[PDB]
Symmetry: C2
Protein backbone atom coordinates (compact mmCIF):
# COMPACT_ATOMS: atom_id res chain seq x y z
CA UNK A 1 0.00 0.00 0.00
CA UNK A 2 2.80 2.38 1.01
CA UNK A 3 4.74 1.47 -2.14
CA UNK A 4 2.26 3.28 -4.43
CA UNK A 5 2.72 6.94 -5.54
CA UNK A 6 -1.02 7.56 -5.11
CA UNK A 7 -0.95 6.62 -1.41
CA UNK A 8 -0.22 9.52 0.94
CA UNK A 9 -0.41 7.92 4.38
CA UNK A 10 -1.34 10.40 7.10
CA UNK A 11 -2.23 13.31 4.76
CA UNK A 12 -5.07 15.31 6.39
CA UNK A 13 -8.51 15.88 4.87
CA UNK A 14 -7.82 19.59 4.45
CA UNK A 15 -4.41 19.12 2.85
CA UNK A 16 -5.73 16.35 0.59
CA UNK A 17 -8.43 18.66 -0.72
CA UNK A 18 -5.94 21.44 -1.39
CA UNK A 19 -3.68 18.97 -3.18
CA UNK A 20 -6.33 17.67 -5.59
CA UNK A 21 -7.79 21.14 -6.12
CA UNK A 22 -4.50 22.68 -7.25
CA UNK A 23 -5.17 23.48 -10.89
CA UNK A 24 -8.89 23.87 -10.37
CA UNK A 25 -11.25 22.19 -12.88
CA UNK A 26 -8.26 21.29 -15.04
CA UNK A 27 -7.10 18.80 -12.38
CA UNK A 28 -10.36 16.88 -12.80
CA UNK A 29 -9.66 13.26 -11.92
CA UNK A 30 -6.61 13.92 -9.76
CA UNK A 31 -6.83 11.84 -6.58
CA UNK A 32 -5.04 10.53 -3.51
CA UNK A 33 -5.63 7.67 -1.10
CA UNK A 34 -4.94 8.54 2.53
CA UNK A 35 -5.60 7.19 6.00
CA UNK A 36 -8.76 8.60 7.59
CA UNK A 37 -8.09 11.05 10.43
CA UNK A 38 -11.48 10.55 12.03
CA UNK A 39 -11.77 6.81 11.37
CA UNK A 40 -8.22 5.41 11.89
CA UNK A 41 -9.21 1.92 10.75
CA UNK A 42 -10.07 3.20 7.28
CA UNK A 43 -8.67 5.00 4.26
CA UNK A 44 -10.26 7.79 2.26
CA UNK A 45 -10.27 8.39 -1.48
CA UNK A 46 -10.00 12.14 -2.08
CA UNK A 47 -10.46 13.38 -5.61
CA UNK A 48 -11.07 16.37 -7.84
CA UNK A 49 -14.42 16.39 -9.63
CA UNK A 50 -14.79 19.39 -11.94
CA UNK A 51 -12.97 21.68 -9.52
CA UNK A 52 -14.50 20.41 -6.26
CA UNK A 53 -12.94 18.05 -3.72
CA UNK A 54 -14.76 14.82 -2.93
CA UNK A 55 -14.01 12.34 -0.17
CA UNK A 56 -15.02 8.70 -0.49
CA UNK A 57 -14.74 6.38 2.52
CA UNK A 58 -12.93 3.11 1.79
CA UNK A 59 -13.88 0.55 4.44
CA UNK A 60 -10.17 -9.83 0.94
CA UNK A 61 -9.49 -7.93 -2.27
CA UNK A 62 -7.10 -5.20 -1.14
CA UNK A 63 -4.55 -6.22 -3.75
CA UNK A 64 -7.03 -6.06 -6.60
CA UNK A 65 -8.15 -2.72 -5.23
CA UNK A 66 -4.55 -1.50 -5.49
CA UNK A 67 -4.40 -2.69 -9.10
CA UNK A 68 -7.49 -0.64 -9.83
CA UNK A 69 -6.09 2.56 -8.27
CA UNK A 70 -2.79 1.95 -10.03
CA UNK A 71 -4.64 1.73 -13.35
CA UNK A 72 -6.45 4.97 -12.70
CA UNK A 73 -3.14 6.55 -11.73
CA UNK A 74 -1.57 5.35 -15.02
CA UNK A 75 -4.16 7.54 -16.71
CA UNK A 76 -3.26 10.64 -14.69
CA UNK A 77 0.42 10.04 -15.33
CA UNK A 78 -0.38 9.76 -19.05
CA UNK A 79 -1.77 13.31 -19.01
CA UNK A 80 1.45 14.37 -17.29
CA UNK A 81 3.72 12.84 -19.95
CA UNK A 82 1.66 13.08 -23.10
CA UNK A 83 -0.04 16.44 -22.51
CA UNK A 84 -2.48 17.69 -25.10
CA UNK A 85 -0.51 20.07 -27.38
CA UNK A 86 -1.65 23.69 -27.42
CA UNK B 1 -28.34 8.24 -10.91
CA UNK B 2 -26.53 4.95 -11.66
CA UNK B 3 -28.52 3.92 -14.74
CA UNK B 4 -27.80 7.30 -16.35
CA UNK B 5 -24.06 6.66 -16.62
CA UNK B 6 -22.41 5.15 -19.73
CA UNK B 7 -20.09 3.03 -17.60
CA UNK B 8 -22.99 1.29 -15.85
CA UNK B 9 -24.15 -1.87 -17.61
CA UNK B 10 -26.95 -3.16 -15.36
CA UNK B 11 -27.52 -6.91 -15.75
CA UNK B 12 -24.29 -7.61 -17.73
CA UNK B 13 -22.97 -11.05 -16.74
CA UNK B 14 -19.52 -11.72 -15.25
CA UNK B 15 -18.44 -13.60 -18.38
CA UNK B 16 -19.72 -10.98 -20.82
CA UNK B 17 -18.17 -8.18 -18.75
CA UNK B 18 -14.76 -9.85 -18.89
CA UNK B 19 -15.09 -10.31 -22.65
CA UNK B 20 -16.03 -6.64 -22.99
CA UNK B 21 -13.07 -5.22 -21.06
CA UNK B 22 -10.65 -7.71 -22.63
CA UNK B 23 -11.45 -6.78 -26.23
CA UNK B 24 -8.26 -5.09 -27.41
CA UNK B 25 -6.12 -7.09 -25.01
CA UNK B 26 -3.36 -5.24 -23.09
CA UNK B 27 -4.18 -2.11 -25.11
CA UNK B 28 -7.53 -1.82 -23.33
CA UNK B 29 -5.75 -1.51 -20.00
CA UNK B 30 -7.96 0.55 -17.71
CA UNK B 31 -11.25 -0.09 -19.52
CA UNK B 32 -13.96 -0.92 -17.02
CA UNK B 33 -17.64 -1.48 -16.42
CA UNK B 34 -19.87 -1.40 -13.35
CA UNK B 35 -22.53 -4.12 -13.35
CA UNK B 36 -24.98 -5.73 -10.96
CA UNK B 37 -23.59 -8.86 -9.32
CA UNK B 38 -25.19 -12.13 -10.27
CA UNK B 39 -24.13 -14.09 -7.18
CA UNK B 40 -24.92 -11.37 -4.61
CA UNK B 41 -28.28 -9.76 -5.67
CA UNK B 42 -27.83 -6.58 -3.67
CA UNK B 43 -24.40 -5.54 -4.87
CA UNK B 44 -22.52 -4.33 -7.91
CA UNK B 45 -19.19 -5.38 -9.34
CA UNK B 46 -16.42 -3.33 -10.88
CA UNK B 47 -14.93 -5.29 -13.78
CA UNK B 48 -11.81 -3.93 -15.39
CA UNK B 49 -8.90 -4.71 -17.67
CA UNK B 50 -5.49 -4.77 -16.00
CA UNK B 51 -2.68 -5.38 -18.48
CA UNK B 52 -4.77 -7.78 -20.55
CA UNK B 53 -6.47 -9.65 -17.71
CA UNK B 54 -10.00 -9.22 -16.36
CA UNK B 55 -10.40 -8.27 -12.70
CA UNK B 56 -13.61 -8.22 -10.68
CA UNK B 57 -13.91 -5.99 -7.62
CA UNK B 58 -16.95 -6.37 -5.32
CA UNK B 59 -18.38 -2.95 -4.49
CA UNK B 60 -22.50 5.02 3.88
CA UNK B 61 -24.67 7.29 1.75
CA UNK B 62 -21.66 8.08 -0.44
CA UNK B 63 -23.09 6.47 -3.58
CA UNK B 64 -23.29 9.80 -5.39
CA UNK B 65 -19.66 10.65 -4.65
CA UNK B 66 -18.83 7.11 -5.79
CA UNK B 67 -20.52 7.87 -9.11
CA UNK B 68 -18.54 11.08 -9.52
CA UNK B 69 -15.36 9.07 -8.99
CA UNK B 70 -16.22 6.50 -11.66
CA UNK B 71 -17.33 9.22 -14.03
CA UNK B 72 -13.99 10.97 -13.59
CA UNK B 73 -12.12 7.76 -14.34
CA UNK B 74 -14.31 7.26 -17.39
CA UNK B 75 -13.53 10.79 -18.57
CA UNK B 76 -9.78 10.00 -18.67
CA UNK B 77 -10.06 6.75 -20.66
CA UNK B 78 -10.46 8.60 -23.97
CA UNK B 79 -7.07 10.36 -23.98
CA UNK B 80 -5.55 7.29 -22.35
CA UNK B 81 -6.77 5.01 -25.15
CA UNK B 82 -5.83 7.61 -27.73
Amino acid sequence: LSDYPWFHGTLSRVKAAQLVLAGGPRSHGLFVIRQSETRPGECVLTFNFQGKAKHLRLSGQCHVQHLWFQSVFDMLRHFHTHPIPL
